[PDB]
Amino acid sequence: SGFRKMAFPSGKVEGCMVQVTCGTTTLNGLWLDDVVYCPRHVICTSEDMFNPNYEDLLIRKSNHNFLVQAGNVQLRVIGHSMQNCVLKLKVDTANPKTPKYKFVRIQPGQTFSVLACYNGSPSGVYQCAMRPNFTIKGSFLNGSCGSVGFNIDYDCVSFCYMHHMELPTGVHAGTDLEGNFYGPFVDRQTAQAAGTDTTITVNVLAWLYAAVINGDRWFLNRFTTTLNDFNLVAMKYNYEPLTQDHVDILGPLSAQTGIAVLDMCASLKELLQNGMNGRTILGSALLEDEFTPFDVVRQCSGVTFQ
Amino acid sequence: SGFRKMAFPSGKVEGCMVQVTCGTTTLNGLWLDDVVYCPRHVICTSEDMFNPNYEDLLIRKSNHNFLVQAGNVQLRVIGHSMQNCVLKLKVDTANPKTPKYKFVRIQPGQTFSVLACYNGSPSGVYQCAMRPNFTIKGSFLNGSCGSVGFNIDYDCVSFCYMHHMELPTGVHAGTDLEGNFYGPFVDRQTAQAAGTDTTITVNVLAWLYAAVINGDRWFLNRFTTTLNDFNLVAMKYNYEPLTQDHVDILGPLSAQTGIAVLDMCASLKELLQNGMNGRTILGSALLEDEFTPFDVVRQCSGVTFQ
């Protein structure tokens, strides 16, 4: 029993974290097969980040300038290239610690594990979610660029996030591992407004679904409410609307609790309209939108990777 | 920046995660050098768990009765022994994935990362704290005994936990790696009492300092309160008492922020008497006792002026 925000075992990823130093900048790279992925902004120093023409900045550049190193061993680039907002560079030797892996871009509301790294060495691991305004709530300090976001299925490690920078509203933005930013964001350092954020409803539903799994009944209430009055009180309290698709993703948990996915919405309305009235669901008076239903099953079943 | 319950990279431990099977029972072992550590009650059937004589059960069991496997390849047990409530298995070959490590006992209110395991295969990583009543609130289903607790300091993984059981209120109890349970518990199906639990004061005090690092002071207050009448309203709100030593380890967070531990103490007492009035400190309407001041420094860099 018990329920905790849970990260995947970082082990398959740690082996790919390397330090890249190009000029005055140092950040982290992803050493997969025989190529290192890292944020496009390694070629530019911290002073000229206002508006660099990155395409022009690379035209003069050559392989030899880049010092990519694994722990202590140094590596040389036999080919450099820029795809979107990464700088994928082919190195002399492959990484034999490369796991089975996939590149994926995830849609707002999913969750993943982050492996924070500073100067090529992982420092920490935690669990976040792509916010509906295309941000994340991370812990990233200086020298943390290129720290990755990932999921695991069996042997396979699908990477889904690579860190680029911090917004003036405290949050972070980056790209997918194809180098394409998440959200109305860009790398060039500018005032980008962290859009307004809505609560991910289906993920709050799932966390209530961990709750009755864990043996919490406080919020339970019998009377039910229409599908669309949910969408109605959803927009009222800045909650993302439910679709039938979510009702189907909740299907797997539906039978296991024995509650219809609709009835819990009504108990949710009780939480949202009446407030928590000073009590706790799964050790939180906060409604939690940072858990997807795959997240809840992985913890109540206890699936594994190896 | 930002603040997250963050675990250490579990990679160094995963290489030691191994499966142990005795009879009909399977749980996890800690494969360090050429010995596997695991909870002693794997020699036990569900029948003898009510009252076991472990010495007798272990003589009856032999080298060949123990099956330790790498999720894949089998390993050979050429020696078994019992240290308190663990079970050292001298295995034929050493583990070339052995980290630098320490066997360590931690004090209540300290924190560590747990790597949950099932059939020798990891499932997840998260952050905990040994509670003052000597429990932890984990995520543990069946087949998770022998999941270890660890920290990482530079290279070495100071080990501090091997999980044994679940208490009737949902929480968990286990041992150190010398085999000694934290708390008045032992491995025997009995009426085992989960003691009453108090909140870790020093961690909340520290956790307020992550909040002023965020630079939001809504909780900061003009009102001051004395040091020792606090220890009194502490027992009133079931908090373990603050000590001066606690304040000296907390001092480093004080000096870099410039807040005296006393006024943060006063803001806390005022905070608990009237409540937060529906506002949130670091995205939580619940106070956090699971962050050490070392945790707060490990996550906030800070600097100190003199």
Residue numbers in the entry:
A (entry chain B), B (entry chain A): 1 to 306
According to the publication:
SARS-CoV-2 Mpro is a cysteine protease that forms a dimer composed of two protomers. Each protomer comprises the chymotrypsin and 3C-like peptidase domains I and II (residues 10–99 and 100–182, respectively), with the active site consisting of a Cys145-His41 catalytic dyad located in the cleft between the two antiparallel-β-barrel domains. Mpro cleaves the polyproteins at 11 positions with a consensus cleavage sequence Leu Gln | (Ser, Ala, Gly) to release nsp’s, which are required to assemble the viral replication-transcription complex. In addition to the indispensable role in viral replication, SARS-CoV-2 Mpro also plays an essential role in escaping antiviral defense by cleaving host cell proteins.
Crystal structures of 11 Mpro mutants provided structural insight into their altered functionality. We employed crystallographic structural analysis together with a high fidelity FRET activity assay by our group to assess the functional and structural changes in Mpro mutants. The crystal structures of several variants revealed the changes in side chains orientations of residues in the active site comprising substrate binding pockets, especially S2 and S4, which might lead to altered amino acids preferences. Accordingly, changes in KM values for most of variants were observed, indicating alterations in a mode of substrate binding. We observe the highest level of conformational plasticity around the S2′ and S3′ binding pockets with N142 and S46 being the most flexible residues within the structures we solved. Also, we observed that the charge distribution in the active site changes quite dramatically even upon a single substitution especially around the S3′ and S2 binding pockets. This might explain why with most mutants we see the changes in binding affinities and not the kcat values.
